[PDB]
Design a protein around this nucleic acid. Structure first.
Ligand code: FES
Ligand SMILES: [K+]
Ligand SMILES: [Mg+2]
Ligand SMILES: [Mg+2]
Ligand SMILES: [Mg+2]
Ligand SMILES: [Mg+2]
Ligand SMILES: [Mg+2]
Ligand SMILES: [Mg+2]
Ligand SMILES: [Mg+2]
Ligand SMILES: [Mg+2]
Ligand SMILES: [Mg+2]
Ligand SMILES: [Mg+2]
Ligand SMILES: [Mg+2]
Ligand SMILES: [Mg+2]
Ligand SMILES: [Mg+2]
Ligand SMILES: [Mg+2]
Lengths: 100, 78, 97, 137, 50, 22, 117, 122, 86, 97, 111
RNA sequence: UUGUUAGGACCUAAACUCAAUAACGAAAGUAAUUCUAGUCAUUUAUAAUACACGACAGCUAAGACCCAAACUGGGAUUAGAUACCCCACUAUGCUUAGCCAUAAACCUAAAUAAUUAAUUAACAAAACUAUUUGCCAGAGAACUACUAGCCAUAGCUUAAAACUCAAAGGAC
């Protein structure tokens, strides 16, 4: 049985390295009006806006392309003892993935 | 808390600085996904097993091997 | 108080040792089974609204109870007044969150 | 090919002329806007007096002498004397930060003078004279 | 080694120092060639001599 | 804190200065 | 960039004399202040002066200033609708930004904690 | 030490400017100096009107004189140059090249300060 | 006094928008801090008062600027409720 | 023990420190073209480090050079010389709306 | 005064042992690197080194009490010359009196 | 008198922006420019009856004087207004020497070396150990009386008792 240490070393997330300005594939699982909730394989989903072009194409289950920025949006503020987190990830929707 | 840094990160850091992230998009839902960078690190390791000791030699030779494989590596300084 | 369970920090993101998780999860599931075997009341509790319906659906499937809504002050410390004189309180509370 | 807020540079060649006059030649309207009285003097580019006016000379007195409408009247009066003397374009150097700082320039516009630029010369010492003590209220 | 080199450089530089013999000639060479210390940087930190 | 204890010393010192003046 | 707050307050770490002496603790609150009311500016002030100007010459006789009187009504009639239309729509929408009440409720969903949990 | 003179001279014709620069540098030598270089920066308009020797000046010729001199000579040089009638404004400073451009590795990000107040609930 | 006249604090009127020229002139003097300087130079501010004021303004700027960050940091999470009804 | 355990090392991906637009450059009082890029075109006032973007060290070098240049008959004090009104803009500021 | 004052023709302590080795150096170069074209601080580094040779058994060591005392005797005489011109300098009058007291403390430990 | 002066003289006084900086100095204090002189090694803590300093105000002699300004005079306000507001003007703030030695001289936190768990009287700027000196022992009487020292003479430091009360005080 593979060890947890081995699993982590060869994990896709460990291979990604820093997540800033990386390209990843996500999946839309929830849509509220023109807001798309996209799972890109991380801890937290991201929330993007439906593009004007090919808006109807972005339906639930649609795999898309993204440019990650943060896996979790967090920041300590003046007088805080802990980082405030919004339980959300940061990414830029680039467009649909070609099925090919 | 131990900062998690494997030995491949030295190689991966150079690859991202020289070529950026592979134009192919990462798929983090496939448990066995092999990215363009991870193949670079697998070849760089193979050459290092042969006994090459110069980092410059291993980086330019690995680029040539992937070029023969057909992977499109762009040395984007931008 | 979580640093014992953290395998390390992968570029800012804490990683949780899944070896300690496996050991602790074994104990927690073992305890939850003996409580269920002895016909004890199990209450699932969470306030995450993304998973509110899933957790209420699980409790119904198991045959147990779920409280995923706003928790009234005194629910357990003042149970007799809120629910009635002979209300039986939960024997185990599972906090998914 | 755009308008420049910055004034022409003295000693250079520019295409900007007003009524066949260069920038250095256009007469200057000196407005001293204080918190009590707003004075106005118009001079030629050789520093020769052409018009003079102020809220006091118009006839305002005490607290009325320091209102916006009082300076507006003073500017219109200064324009009339300057317009008679032969002035159509003025460079407005507005000293002071009082109530009739803008009103005096608005009166000059109402009086038939064409402002081409606005300078500010409010005294700002670089370290100078100790000001009078703060008033208690 | 460093101090010996620094002394030798100063000895080479002293060849072109001004003296009473070459004063007038050096003055006219300076007057003929003006110098400029002006230059500007961009938001990218690049010198932009005109 | 209030200045009450300073006010007592304030009056003691003022009254003493006028006694010395007299 | 927020000013530096290192070596400013009077503390046992700081060797030198303090720079800043805050009246109140420097901890972000979970509310925003109630924005103080803003008032508008006079509308049709120029047109009123024009109307009044003509009267002065014509002994306050509306026969001479008929055209100017109609301009004063025109400006007021436009502004009358403008104040009506803008209050009904723009103020209700609050589209551009949040109000103090809406902002504070969002600041309370992710509140600042100066104490350990 | 190594001193850089900044000599603004009266606007004059080259014959007289050259004569003024020979008289000036000779004074530096007479004060125990070792002149290293002479540079011209050109005639230009002064940033403001400087009044020297009962004359108002709007244009002057800017010159630099690099030299060595004892620490005691700096005062004597400035006194003499201020008495010259073709010197608008003499300013002696320590030569900039003696000071070295310091080595830097960018701005270090110092984080927002913490542990300023106790963790007591409010 | 010894400088050249009409270069400093001077604006040019564009197509007869004198009010715009005045409004730009004031924006310059306010942005450059001259307005506050002339406002505070009417009377004398005591050295202790000046230091108390600068300490106050710096602490306010620190708070206001940081408060803006939290507002902008949470601006994105203000969206339609995805989990309405639960 | 375990070959796959992480190895202590300095962060390979650590990002470089940002430098100011005058980092490792010589600020001279005689370079009035560069000094003029950090003053106001209208009043000639020195900009603060929240506008120039300089570090503490280079901000003080520019400040000490503008004052020396202004005091030695090289630079004007009450405005920016009209010659340098066209030079590159390296300060975050907009007088026009 | 004191028996020894460095001559104006002497080289600074950086090049004191370097110029002698160099085969031939111009008069000007020697004058630039002499004590005539240096600050007073350089002339004091030469005064101290002379005294360390004439007193200390091992002039290579500057951390001995005898060497520390010699370092303070040069400063004390330097502060005194300063105070002969700047009669109302209270910071340097403090520096002078504090160095004298420091020497007395070191001389006591040495004894 | 006023406004303008790209006119002249003066060089009195004070140092905008930079400074959203936080450096230097034992403290007091110190930020217009230039140059000269200049801070530096005692293991560390610990000192008076000694030595040297010490904001502001004030004193002595001679100068300076743009502006500010106790006092004083005039105007107003008020029932009164020996005030708050307005005008004028002096001691004084400046310089050269000497004196005085006091501040909410407080960052109300002595200095030094640690420690961050075995640890909330309240509030403030988290708790706490060791070392050495100084200081405190209910409030008022009392920054007082007397004594001694001091360039101080309506002064400073030093500093009680009688007598009165059953509280005063701190935080909430
Ligand atoms: S960041 Fe390097 S000198 Fe400014
Ligand atoms: K205090
Ligand atoms: Mg209070
Ligand atoms: Mg009493
Ligand atoms: Mg307080
Ligand atoms: Mg006059
Ligand atoms: Mg004048
Ligand atoms: Mg020196
Ligand atoms: Mg009276
Ligand atoms: Mg006087
Ligand atoms: Mg005095
Ligand atoms: Mg005392
Ligand atoms: Mg103090
Ligand atoms: Mg006392
Ligand atoms: Mg007494
Ligand atoms: Mg006594």
């Amino acid at each position: 049985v593979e060890s947890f240490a081995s699993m982590l070393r060869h994990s896709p997330l460990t291979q990604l390295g820093p997540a800033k300005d990386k390209l990843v594939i996500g999946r839309i699982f929830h849509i509220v009006e023109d807001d798309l909730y996209i799972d890109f394989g991380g801890k937290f989903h991201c929330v993007c806006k439906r593009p004007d072009v090919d808006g109807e194409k972005y339906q639930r289950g649609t795999r898309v392309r993204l440019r990650l920025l943060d896996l979790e949006l967090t920041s300590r503020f003046l007088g805080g003892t802990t980082d405030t987190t919004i339980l959300e990830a940061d990414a830029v929707l680039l467009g649909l993935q070609e099925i090919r | 808390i131990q900062d998690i840094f494997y030995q491949e990160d030295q190689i991966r850091a150079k690859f991202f600085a020289t070529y950026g992230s592979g134009q192919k998009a990462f798929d983090l839902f496939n448990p066995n996904f092999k990215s363009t960078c991870q193949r670079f690190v697998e070849k760089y390791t193979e050459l290092q097993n042969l006994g090459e000791t110069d980092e410059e030699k291993l980086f330019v030779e690995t680029g040539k091997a992937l070029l023969a494989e057909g992977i499109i590596l762009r040395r984007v300084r931008e | 108080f979580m640093e014992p369970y953290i395998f390390g920090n992968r570029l800012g993101q804490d990683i949780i040792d899944l070896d300690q998780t496996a050991l602790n999860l074994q104990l927690a599931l073992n305890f939850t089974a003996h409580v269920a075997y002895r016909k004890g009341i199990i209450l699932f509790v969470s306030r995450n609204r993304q998973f509110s319906h899933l957790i209420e659906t699980t409790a119904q499937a198991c045959g147990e109870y779920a409280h995923t809504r706003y928790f009234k002050g005194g629910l357990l410390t003042n149970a007799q007044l809120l629910f009635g004189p002979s209300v039986r309180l939960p024997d185990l509370i599972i906090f998914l969150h | 090919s755009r308008f420049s807020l910055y004034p022409p540079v003295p000693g250079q060649e520019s295409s900007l002329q007003w009524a066949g006059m260069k920038f250095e030649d256009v007469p200057i309207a000196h407005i001293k806007a204080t918190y009590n009285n707003t004075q106005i003097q118009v001079v030629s580019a050789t520093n020769a007096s052409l018009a003079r006016a102020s809220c006091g000379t118009e006839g305002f007195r005490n607290a009325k002498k320091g209102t916006g409408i009082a300076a507006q009247t003073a500017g219109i009066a200064a324009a009339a004397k300057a317009t008679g003397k032969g002035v159509t374009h003025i460079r407005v150097v507005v000293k002071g930060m009082g109530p009739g700082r803008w009103s005096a320039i608005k009166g000059l516009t109402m009086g038939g003078l064409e402002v081409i630029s606005i300078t500010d010369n409010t005294p700002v010492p670089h370290x100078g004279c100790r000001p009078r003590k703060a008033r208690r209220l | 080694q460093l101090k010996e080199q620094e002394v030798l450089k100063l000895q080479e530089e002293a060849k072109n120092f001004i003296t009473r013999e070459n004063l007038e000639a050096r003055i006219e060479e300076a007057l003929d060639s003006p110098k400029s210390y002006n230059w500007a940087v961009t938001k990218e930190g690049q010198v932009v001599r005109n | 804190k209030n200045v009450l204890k300073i006010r007592r010393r304030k009056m003691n010192h003022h009254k003493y200065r006028k006694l010395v003046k007299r | 960039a927020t000013p530096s707050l290192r070596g400013r307050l009077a503390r046992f770490a700081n060797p030198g004399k303090p720079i800043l002496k805050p009246n109140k603790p420097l901890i972000l609150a979970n509310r925003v202040g109630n924005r103080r009311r803003e008032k508008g500016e006079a509308t049709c002030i120029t047109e009123m002066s024009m109307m009044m100007a003509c009267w002065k010459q014509n002994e306050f006789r509306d026969e001479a200033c008929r055209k100017e009187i109609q301009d004063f009504f025109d400006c007021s009639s436009r502004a009358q609708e403008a104040r009506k239309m803008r209050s009904i729509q723009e103020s209700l929408g609050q589209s551009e930004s949040l109000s103090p009440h809406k902002m504070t409720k969002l600041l309370q969903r992710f509140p600042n904690k100066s104490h350990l949990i | 030490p190594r001193y850089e003179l900044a000599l603004i001279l009266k606007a004059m014709r080259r014959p007289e400017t050259a004569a003024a620069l020979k008289r000036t540098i000779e004074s530096l030598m007479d004060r125990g100096a070792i002149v290293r270089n002479l540079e011209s920066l050109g005639e230009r308009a002064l940033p403001y009107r400087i009044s020297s020797h009962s004359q108002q000046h709007s244009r002057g010729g800017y010159f630099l004189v690099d030299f060595y001199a004892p620490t005691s000579a700096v005062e004597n040089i400035l006194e003499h140059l201020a008495r010259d009638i073709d010197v608008v404004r003499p300013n002696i400073v320590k030569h900039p090249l003696t000071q070295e451009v310091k080595e830097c590795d960018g701005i270090v990000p110092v984080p927002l300060e913490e542990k300023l107040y106790s963790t007591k609930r409010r | 006094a010894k400088h050249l006249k009409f270069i400093a604090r001077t604006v040019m009127v564009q197509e007869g928008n004198v009010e715009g020229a005045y409004r730009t002139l004031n924006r310059i003097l306010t942005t450059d801090g001259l307005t506050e300087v002339i406002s505070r130079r009417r009377y004398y501010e005591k050295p202790c008062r000046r230091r108390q004021r600068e300490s106050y303004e710096t602490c306010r700027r620190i708070y206001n600027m940081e408060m803006a960050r939290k507002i902008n940091f949470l601006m994105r999470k203000n969206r339609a409720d995805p989990w309405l009804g639960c | 023990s375990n070959e796959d355990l992480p190895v202590p090392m300095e962060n390979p991906y650590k990002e470089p420190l940002k430098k100011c637009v005058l980092c490792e450059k010589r600020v001279d009082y005689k370079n009035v073209q560069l000094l003029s890029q950090f003053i106001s075109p209208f009043t000639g006032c020195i900009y603060g480090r929240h506008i120039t973007g300089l570090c503490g060290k280079k901000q003080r070098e520019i400040t000490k050079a503008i004052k020396r240049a202004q005091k030695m008959g090289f630079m004007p004090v009450t405005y920016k010389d009209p010659a340098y009104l066209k030079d590159p803009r390296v300060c975050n500021i907009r007088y026009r709306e | 005064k004191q028996d020894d004052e460095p001559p104006s023709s002497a080289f600074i302590k950086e090049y004191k042992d370097i110029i002698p080795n160099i085969e031939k150096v111009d008069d000007v170069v020697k004058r630039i690197l002499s004590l005539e074209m240096a600050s007073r601080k350089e002339k004091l580094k030469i005064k101290q080194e002379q005294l360390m040779n004439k007193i200390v058994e091992n002039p290579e060591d500057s951390r001995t009490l005898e060497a520390q005392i010699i370092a303070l005797t040069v400063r004390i005489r330097n502060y005194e010359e300063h105070m002969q011109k700047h009669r109302k300098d209270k910071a340097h009058k403090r520096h002078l009196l504090m160095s004298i007291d420091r020497r007395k403390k070191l001389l006591k430990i040495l004894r």
